[PDB]
Amino acid sequence: AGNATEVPANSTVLSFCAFAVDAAKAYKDYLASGGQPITNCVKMLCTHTGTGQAITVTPEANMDQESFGGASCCLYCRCHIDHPNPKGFCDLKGKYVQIPTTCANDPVGFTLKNTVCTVCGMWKGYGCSC
Amino acid sequence: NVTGLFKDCSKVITGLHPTQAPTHLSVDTKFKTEGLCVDIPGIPKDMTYRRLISMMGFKMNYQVNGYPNMFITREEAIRHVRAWIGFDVEGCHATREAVGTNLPLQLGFSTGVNLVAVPTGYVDTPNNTDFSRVSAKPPPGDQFKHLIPLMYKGLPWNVVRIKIVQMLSDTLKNLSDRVVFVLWAHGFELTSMKYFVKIGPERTCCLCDRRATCFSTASDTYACWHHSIGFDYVYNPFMIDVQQWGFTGNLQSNHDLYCQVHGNAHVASCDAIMTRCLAVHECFVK
Numbered sequence: 001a002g003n004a005t006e007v008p009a010n011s012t013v014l015s016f017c018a019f020a021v022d023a024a025k026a027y028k029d030y031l032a033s034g035g036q037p038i039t040n041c042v043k044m045l046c047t048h049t050g051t052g053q054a055i056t057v058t059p060e061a062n063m064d065q066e067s068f069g070g071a072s073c074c075l076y077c078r079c080h081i082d083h084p085n086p087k088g089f090c091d092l093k094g095k096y097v098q099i100p101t102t103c104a105n106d107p108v109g110f111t112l113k114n115t116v117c118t119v120c121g122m123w124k125g126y127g128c129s130c
Numbered sequence: 131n132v133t134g135l136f137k138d139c140s141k142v143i144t145g146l147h148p149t150q151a152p153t154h155l156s157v158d159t160k161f162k163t164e165g166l167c168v169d170i171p172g173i174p175k176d177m178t179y180r181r182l183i184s185m186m187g188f189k190m191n192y193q194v195n196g197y198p199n200m201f202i203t204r205e206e207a208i209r210h211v212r213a214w215i216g217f218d219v220e221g222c223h224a225t226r227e228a229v230g231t232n233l234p235l236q237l238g239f240s241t242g243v244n245l246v247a248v249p250t251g252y253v254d255t256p257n258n259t260d261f262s263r264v265s266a267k268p269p270p271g272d273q274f275k276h277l278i279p280l281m282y283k284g285l286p287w288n289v290v291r292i293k294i295v296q297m298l299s300d301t302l303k304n305l306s307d308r309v310v311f312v313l314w315a316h317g318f319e320l321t322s323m324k325y326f327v328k329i330g331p332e333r334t335c336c337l338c339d340r341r342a343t344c345f346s347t348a349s350d351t352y353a354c355w356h357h358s359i360g361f362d363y364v365y366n367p368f369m370i371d372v373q374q375w376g377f378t379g380n381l382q383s384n385h386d387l388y389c390q391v392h393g394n395a396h397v398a399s400c401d402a403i404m405t406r407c408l409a410v411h412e413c414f415v416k
């Protein structure tokens with residue numbers, strides 16, 4: 001009974017991060033040890049003529065981005081572990097995340113390492129104008 | 131190709147909305163096209179769901195610099211025979227709101243201790259994963275008739291994990307700088323470990339220079355078996371699966387070949403005693 005959510009290629013990293021005291025550090029160290037990025041993310045088929053904002057209600061990928069389902073880009077959602085922010089609630093689950101096409105190979109690692117500019121709503125460095 | 135790890139055990143006939151689905155596999159079929167997903171304005175997110183996620187299927191085969199391996203060799207386990215603690219878990223089946231996974235019920239150790247936990251699971255919601263009590267039933271009543279009364283004598287996991295740390299610390303402080311859980315068909319024991327174990331790089335105690343064997347979430351601190359008073363997590367434990375040492379039959383029949391003093395009392399701690407006993411007879415005789 002029940003429906004499988006995962007593929008075997010993710011078993012090792014998901015199990016490693018599901019037992020870690022610090023799962024974000026565990027994932028970054030896992031990648032640094034040659035480990036493959038988390039796959040099976042929710043990649044969107046979109047027009048690529050969107051606002052380009054980082055976290056949106058609908059897919060807003062521009063020509064330089066790929067749109068993804070938010071929960072699928074969140075290490076804490078992917079591992080079924082506690083979220084770090086004091087309220088324990090997620091900012092990506094329930095939204096779409098725009099990831100630069102150059103970093104689309106590792107959407108989970110991108111959201112873990114980067115921040116959204118609170119002024120323009122775009123990723124710092126990809127491509128916040130400030 | 132798929133795994134049972136993180137299997138959705140809810141009875142919901144629908145998949146998830148693209149923004150809420152942890153994976154492409156779990157996105158509802160209505161949003162799928164050409165290997166990808168589409169957003170359908172007018173089909174909204176679900177804001178009330180409760181989906182039990184299965185903790186059966188962990189694979190601890192990571193190889194990361196500075197992170198010790200949980201599963202050790204027989205030769206390394208032999209060297210650390212003073213750390214050996216037999217471990218077995220009797221589980222209950224998810225029922226009513228969910229079906230398809232097992233939850234820890236009675237945790238048994240070679241120390242002779244049996245701890246009963248309330249059936250608790252990892253439930254996904256639109257905001258997070260809620261670790262909480264779930265409806266559960268003992269496995270089809272025959273050899274599991276002793277588990278029926280235990281469904282009500284369980285302690286919350288925050289209490290259970292404190293007692294495990296207290297028991298291991300009291301047993302191993304004068305014997306070893308670590309714990310080696312001695313297992314037979316480790317699958318469900320490793321699933322149960324998710325409830326009381328944390329892993330990471332090697333640390334030292336906060337009150338001494340001995341290696342850290344315990345972790346406290348309340349204070350983000352590490353302690354050895356001597357200073358773990360009030361600690362809730364077992365940190366960086368070791369383990370080995372005795373079943374993989376070339377044995378043909380079940381646990382009892384293999385244990386009974388060398389030992390006639392541990393009669394099967396059909397309880398978690400009895401299996402844990404038989405597991406450690408079998409490991410000792412196998413590793414140190416001839």
Ligand SMILES: O=S1(=O)C[C@H](c2ccccc2)CN1
Pocket residue numbers: 003004005138144145146155156157158159160
């Ligand atoms: O609609 S579907 O394509 C997605 C659904 C599913 C739900 C929950 C977890 C995994 C999978 C199974 N059929």
Ligand SMILES: [Zn+2]
Pocket residue numbers: 071074075076077078083090091092093
């Ligand atoms: Zn999340």
Ligand SMILES: [Zn+2]
Pocket residue numbers: 117118119120121122128129130
């Ligand atoms: Zn900006």
Ligand SMILES: [Zn+2]
Pocket residue numbers: 335336337338339340353354355356357
């Ligand atoms: Zn100490």
Ligand SMILES: [Zn+2]
Pocket residue numbers: 385389390391392403404407408
């Ligand atoms: Zn025996």
